[PDB]
Amino acid sequence: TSHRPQLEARSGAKAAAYTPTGIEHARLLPGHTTLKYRKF
RNA sequence: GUUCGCGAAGUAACCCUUCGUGGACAUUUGGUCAAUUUGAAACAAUACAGAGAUGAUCAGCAGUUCCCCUGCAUAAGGAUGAACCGUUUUACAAAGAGAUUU
C-alpha cells in the first residue's frame, strides 16, 4: 500500500509561498524576444 | 607641499635666501564581515541488518510530503530516492414491541 492514487494536486500556493533560488535554466535564456502584432 | 599677493630681516643690496602673513590648488575611506572551541556542514569510525508487490527473483513510471541529495537542467539518477502500511465511534434518526419510576 506504499503506492497510492492521487487525491488532490500539489497546490501552487505551496510554490508561491517558497522563496525562489536563482537557477538560470537552459530554456529560460532570452529567446523570441519580439512579440509580433497583427494589423490593427 | 606647489603657486599668487604683501610685509619684515640679512641689507642705505629691485641679485638671492630666510621669517611672518592673506588667498588658491587638495576635503570625510573602510566594515551585513573580529583571529581555533561555545551560533551549529556532512561523511567517515563501531555494531547489526541488508530492498515494493508475494511462494521466490525482480524492471519500473507515478502520486502526497511542513524529506531532500547528485545533477547545468524543465533531462536523468539516487532501493520504484527515503517516509506511505499506523490508529480507526456522534452531519445518528425513525417505526414497533415488552419490562420499569409516577
CA-to-CA distance for A4 and A6, rounded, in angstroms?
Answer: 7
Q: Nearest nucleotide to A4 by CA–C1' distance?
A: B63
Distance CA A34, CA A37 (A): 9
Q: Which three cell numbers stand for residue A16?
A: 508561491
Taking the CA of residue A9 and the C1' sugar atom of nucleotide B17, their distance in angstroms comes to: 97
Residue with cell 503506492: A3
Per the rule left: phi > 0, alpha: psi between -120 and 50, beta: everything else, A32 is left
List the grid coordinates of A17: 509561498
Q: Which residue has the cell 497510492?
A: A4
φ and ψ of A25, to 5 deg: -75, 165
Listed resolution, Å: 3.7
> Which residue type, as a one-letter code, is found at position A27?
R
What would the grid cell of residue A38 be? 497583427
Nucleotide nearest to A11 (CA to C1'): B64
Tally of CA atoms within 13 A in the half-sphere of A21 that contains its CB:
2
Give long-range contacts, CB 8 A cutoff, 24+ apart: A26-29.
none
C1' of B1 to CA of A34 (Å): 61
